[PDB]
Amino acid sequence: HSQDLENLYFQGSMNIFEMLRIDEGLRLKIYKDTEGYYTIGIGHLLTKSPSLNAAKSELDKAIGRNTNGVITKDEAEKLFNQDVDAAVRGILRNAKLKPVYDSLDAVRRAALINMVFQMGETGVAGFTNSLRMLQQKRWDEAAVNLAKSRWYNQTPNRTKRVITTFRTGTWDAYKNLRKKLEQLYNRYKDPQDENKIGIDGIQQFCDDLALDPASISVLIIAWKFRAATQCEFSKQEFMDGMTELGCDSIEKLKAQIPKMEQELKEPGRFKDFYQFTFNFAKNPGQKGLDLEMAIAYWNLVLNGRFKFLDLWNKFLLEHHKRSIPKDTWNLLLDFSTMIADDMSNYDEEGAWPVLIDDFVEFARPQIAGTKS
Numbered sequence: 355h356s357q358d359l360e361n362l363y364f365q366g367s368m369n370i371f372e373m374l375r376i377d378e379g380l381r382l383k384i385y386k387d388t389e390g391y392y393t394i395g396i397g398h399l400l401t402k403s404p405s406l407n408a409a410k411s412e413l414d415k416a417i418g419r420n421t422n423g424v425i426t427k428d429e430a431e432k433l434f435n436q437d438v439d440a441a442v443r444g445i446l447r448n449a450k451l452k453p454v455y456d457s458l459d460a461v462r463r464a465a466l467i468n469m470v471f472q473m474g475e476t477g478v479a480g481f482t483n484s485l486r487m488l489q490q491k492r493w494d495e496a497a498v499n500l501a502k503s504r505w506y507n508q509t510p511n512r513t514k515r516v517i518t519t520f521r522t523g524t525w526d527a528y529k530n531l532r533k534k535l536e537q538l539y540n541r542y543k544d545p546q547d548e549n550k551i552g553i554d555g556i557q558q559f560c561d562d563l564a565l566d567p568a569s570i571s572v573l574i575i576a577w578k579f580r581a582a583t584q585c586e587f588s589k590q591e592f593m594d595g596m597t598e599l600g601c602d603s604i605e606k607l608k609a610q611i612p613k614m615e616q617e618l619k620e621p622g623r624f625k626d627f628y629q630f631t632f633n634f635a636k637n638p639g640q641k642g643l644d645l646e647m648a649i650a651y652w653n654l655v656l657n658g659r660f661k662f663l664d665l666w667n668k669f670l671l672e673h674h675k676r677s678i679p680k681d682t683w684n685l686l687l688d689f690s691t692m693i694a695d696d697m698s699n700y701d702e703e704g705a706w707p708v709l710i711d712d713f714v715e716f717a718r719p720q721i722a723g724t725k726s
């Protein structure tokens with residue numbers, strides 16, 4: 355087959371795919387990008403359609419099988435290599451980029467392609483002076499001039515690595531990044547399971563970040579790392595998270611925490627965070643969330659946001675053991691958003707969970723007492 359990766363085995367193991375895996379990140383399941391569009395792999399836009407089935411249909415045509423929205427790393431590289439070919443065709447019909455591209459060695463060509471993926475042909479073509487320095491093999495001067503640009507300020511860690519690639523003509527920046535992340539992961543990994551960071555590693559991680567291990571900030575970090583379950587932190591989660599956050603050090607991650615917290619000021623983002631917490635807290639072997647665990651996480655994430663949280667606690671602590679389903683968890687936030695200060699606007703026909711119907715009835719003695 356034309357796209358077989360065996361046809362690339364004559365190349366080095368380091369390549370443009372592995373470069374953008376480090377600089378942009380790799381997703382093996384369909385997700386929505388910043389614009390809300392279905393994407394997979396390394397930034398491969400599937401469709402602008404709002405239908406996930408439409409996105410899966412396009413993915414099946416491109417991959418050649420019924421993937422149901424999930425692909426392998428090798429499949430993502432085949433998809434990416436097609437995108438690279440198209441990007442190179444565009445570079446070669448661009449009067450401003452073809453001369454420099456033709457002049458560059460293979461490693462520096464990858465660096466230019468990297469730039470084109472990030473900012474497009476028109477963006478890269480604007481670097482007139484730096485492109486001329488590259489075409490004249492004035493590597494150090496090109497590196498200095500590129501560092502003065504807004505590009506550098508937008509994505510400093512990625513831009514530093516691309517500049518180093520232009521400066522040296524080697525993969526050193528990417529070898530060094532990989533080793534930095536591996537050595538940082540090794541500080542936290544479970545000595546009995548190399549594939550995850552265990553309870554002790556998470557504690558050390560929190561200590562290195564100067565965080566109280568019971569603070570909401572830890573859960574916010576888990577959310578940004580898309581962690582699947584509490585008390586575990588997989589190697590893929592750690593690497594994907596550090597990549598997406600643009601951090602190759604604890605110091606850089608520490609500086610990112612306030613930006614994660616600020617993202618929650620948007621109700622849409624807090625909703626995403628709140629709903630994430632359910633799947634994160636639930637035992638993977640269970641379908642629902644144990645009531646005691648639900649209470650613990652509700653108190654963490656809703657304190658100061660849900661005006662009836664204290665009454666909710668009293669209500670639940672008198673109830674029998676139950677498993678909280680995802681729909682009940684999600685609708686509690688909707689209830690908190692709409693409910694009047696005295697619950698006078700509750701709509702009993704609104705198809706709320708029975709748990710919330712019962713709660714409104716239970717809060718009646720308290721509500722009347724405060725009014726008297």
Ligand SMILES: CCN1C(=O)[C@@H](NC(=O)c2cccc(C(F)(F)F)c2)[C@@H](c2ccc(F)cc2)c2c(CN)nn(-c3ccccc3)c21
Nearest residue numbers: 556557567568569572573575576581584585586587650654
């Ligand atoms: C802070 C709340 N919280 C978590 O966030 C849990 N995070 C995680 O497991 C977790 C998983 C993957 C990656 C990451 C990260 F590193 F990327 F962030 C974190 C968990 C915890 C365990 C160890 C800690 F060192 C601190 C916190 C935990 C436990 C374990 N019993 N209870 N608990 C809790 C729940 C409600 C109220 C009070 C405490 C929590």
